[PDB]
């Protein structure tokens, strides 16, 4: 999948 930070954090 995608790193959690690139998906959900800004």
């Amino acid at each position, epitope marked *: 999948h*995608h790193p959690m930070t690139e*998906e*959900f954090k*800004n």
Partner: antibody
Amino acid sequence: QSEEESGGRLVTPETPLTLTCTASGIDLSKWPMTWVRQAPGKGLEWIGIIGRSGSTNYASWAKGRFTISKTSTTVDLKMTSPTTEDTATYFCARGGSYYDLWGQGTLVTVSS
Amino acid sequence: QVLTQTASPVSAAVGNTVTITCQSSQSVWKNNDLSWYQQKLGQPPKLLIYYASTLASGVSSRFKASGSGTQFTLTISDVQCDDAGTYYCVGSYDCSSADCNAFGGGTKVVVKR
């Protein structure tokens, strides 16, 4: 660079309801987007998030009753088994870590 | 997660200072992913602070904030009448082992007169 929610209305319990957050001037592929709610006189409550590429996460308390999805211009919140405790103003907001842009909110009433 | 804020109300005369504390039940993402908001009745919240201490664009420098881990404070200096309102902290957490985000309970600021 603006958000506007719509779809808030009176529904009976267990009747599904979809709210729409319409974005203007935002590329929704570049931002996590969040739904928050506030019951009258109460505090803000985080419901969930749709990430940049479309993955989703939700509050533990939601128990799968909320589904967020998005298009290139909108973010939807679908609520599936509403109860009277879901009566609130629902806000969409831009951001995943923190929220810099907000809609004005749309008011959902769950009642017979 | 539960973020516990200062009990309401916090009160101050115009030109005075108030602080609002926000304690997270668990450490926030990277120890500083914590933001602060002002809300007036009938309006959406307004971002004041992000990453625990960074002033949001266009917000008065009267607002400052600090903290790390589980412990955070917002300070409003030179209080003005339009500071009356409710202030919230938002924690950001590791989505893989917790809820991604949570709101504190809110703290009402009352301007003395």
